[PDB]
Every structure is written in structure tokens, then in C-alpha cells.
């Protein structure tokens, strides 16, 4: 199936407390493989998956230099953005960046991303054509015009459609068994009565990978949102994920409700019922 490589960068100003915190992580699909944390000891890019450890010193030296240049760039950005919005030195502010590429089942380029957020809101993003920019506000327009003048999109595009895809392919093959796997959800159901005339049905999905899944409750064959509670998909800690979907049902009609599970590890979507 499809695969992705994604890098996530977070830079946080620390008013009256020195240099910004900078954390960078790399993912292939839902598997992290590298990290840099400004508050860690090595001050280097560090391996986080067995399959990346084999890369030689040339690799690590390079990623280390690049991740520092990324750090340095956002250190300046925090100041630039504070000026753009005429903000005081009193407050802490956050710059976030994400970029990377998707490939299809044929491991050929599908899509590229390159997006910035300031204080948790969209600031600027490369559009899907990888040739133009979406700026969130008037301040962001200044960045847009500067990036148009420097022909940034053209250079990003070459990386996203070419180099980024090259890395993803190389990572996927070195990853081999773990990376390319899909683990179907191990399901089960719970049932604790709440009130005299009501009861809770919780549909469980465990040990699945990748993280992408869909749990849905149906009543007499039709969906239900709004009495259904969905917790956010969560890491189990062993490379698998977990999720659940609950619904409160009239005490006595438990058999009229069905949980529907959709995951790419499942040949066909599952329909479950309490019994």
C-alpha cells in the first residue's frame, strides 16, 4: 500500500530563559526513525529505529548539520514572526513545520507537503501543485512574497518529488519486515450498565498498524454520531496502536447495535455485536 516520510519540527521561544527549545523527529509511516532534541546531550541527529542504525557516519554527519540549520532557521523565524505581529518579549511562542512525501503502492511519488504553523494556527503552506503558496493572513503574505521572490517552491518541489522519494524507498527496503507490515486489529467488546435503563457498549481495537483506522457504531443498520465517544488513537508502545468507540444504549437493545471496523490489514470491514 501507500507509504509516507514525514519530518516534524517544533521551536518554542523561552522569554528571559535563553535559546528556543528545538525538537525534530522523522517518521516513515507511523514509525519514528530519527530525533534531534536541543536539550539532549549529543547535539546530533539520533537513530530511533533499528534499520536506520546501519547508515554510516557520512549520513549522521549530514543529518546533524541539516537539522542544526533547521534549528537556526527557526530561531530567527521566532524573532521575525514576533515582529510581524508586533508581539512583546514577555510571551512564549511556537513555530511548527512539517514536510515530506507520499508514494503509492508502486513506491512512486504521489504527493508532497511543506507547511508552517505559528502558535498552533496555519501560517503558510505549499499547495498541492507544489508551485504556489497559501498564506493565512496579511503577515503570512510577507513570507509568501519573499518565498516567491526567492523561487522557493521550485526548489522544494525538486526535493519533495525526487530526493524525498529516494529516501523513502531506501528506508522502506532497509526496514524490510517491520516497516512494510500491516497488523489487523484484535477486537473485543465491553459492557457495563450505567443507569437502570441504560448501558455502555465499548468496541475495542488493539495491536494494529498502521495507526489509521475507523471505528463506527450502527443502530439497526444506520450510523449514530451523536451518542458515540471516540478516544484518540494511541501508541501501545510496541509499534502497535489502540483505539475504542463507545455508545450508550437503552438497557435491552444491545443486540440492535453493531460496531464497524475498517483497517487496511482487514480484508473486509468487520461487523461486531454484543452477545
Amino acid at each position: 500500500g501507500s507509504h509516507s516520510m514525514r519530518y516534524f519540527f517544533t521551536s518554542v521561544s523561552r522569554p528571559g530563559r535563553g535559546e528556543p527549545r528545538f525538537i525534530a523527529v522523522g517518521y516513515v509511516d507511523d514509525t519514528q526513525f530519527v530525533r534531534f532534541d536541543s536539550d539532549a546531550a549529543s547535539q546530533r541527529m539520533e537513530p530511533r529505529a533499528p534499520w536506520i542504525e546501519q547508515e554510516g557516519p557520512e549520513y549522521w554527519d549530514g543529518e546533524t548539520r541539516k537539522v542544526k540549520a533547521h534549528s537556526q532557521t527557526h530561531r530567527v523565524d521566532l524573532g521575525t514572526l514576533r515582529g510581524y505581529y508586533n508581539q512583546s518579549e514577555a510571551g512564549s511562542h511556537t513555530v511548527q513545520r512539517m514536510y515530506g512525501c507520499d508514494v503509492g503502492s508502486d513506491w512512486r511519488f504521489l504527493r508532497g507537503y511543506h507547511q508552517y504553523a505559528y502558535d498552533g494556527k496555519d501560517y503558510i503552506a505549499l499547495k498541492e501543485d507544489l508551485r504556489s503558496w497559501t498564506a493565512a493572513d496579511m503577515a503570512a503574505q510577507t513570507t509568501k512574497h519573499k518565498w516567491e521572490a526567492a523561487h522557493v517552491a521550485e526548489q522544494l518541489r525538486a526535493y519533495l518529488e525526487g530526493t524525498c522519494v529516494e529516501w523513502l524507498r531506501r528506508y522502506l527496503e532497509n526496514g524490510k519486515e517491520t516497516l512494510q507490515r500491516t497488523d489487523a486489529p484484535k477486537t473485543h467488546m465491553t459492557h457495563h450498565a450505567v443507569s437502570d435503563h441504560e448501558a455502555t457498549l465499548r468496541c475495542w481495537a488493539l495491536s494494529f498498524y498502521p495507526a489509521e483506522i475507523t471505528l463506527t457504531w450502527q443502530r439497526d443498520g444506520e450510523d449514530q454520531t451523536q451518542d458515540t465517544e471516540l478516544v484518540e488513537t494511541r501508541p501501545a508502545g510496541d509499534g502497535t496502536f489502540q483505539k475504542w468507540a463507545a455508545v450508550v444504549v437503552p438497557s435491552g437493545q444491545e443486540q440492535r447495535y453493531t460496531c464497524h471496523v475498517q483497517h487496511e490489514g482487514l480484508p473486509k470491514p468487520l461487523t461486531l455485536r454484543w452477545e
Partner: peptide, 9 residues
């Protein structure tokens, strides 16, 4: 692998 060039906002 990371991009080799960043651009200031």
C-alpha cells in the same frame, strides 16, 4: 534524509 536548505519566513 532532511532537506539541505531552509528559507527564513
Amino acid at each position: 534524509g532532511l532537506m539541505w536548505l531552509s528559507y527564513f519566513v
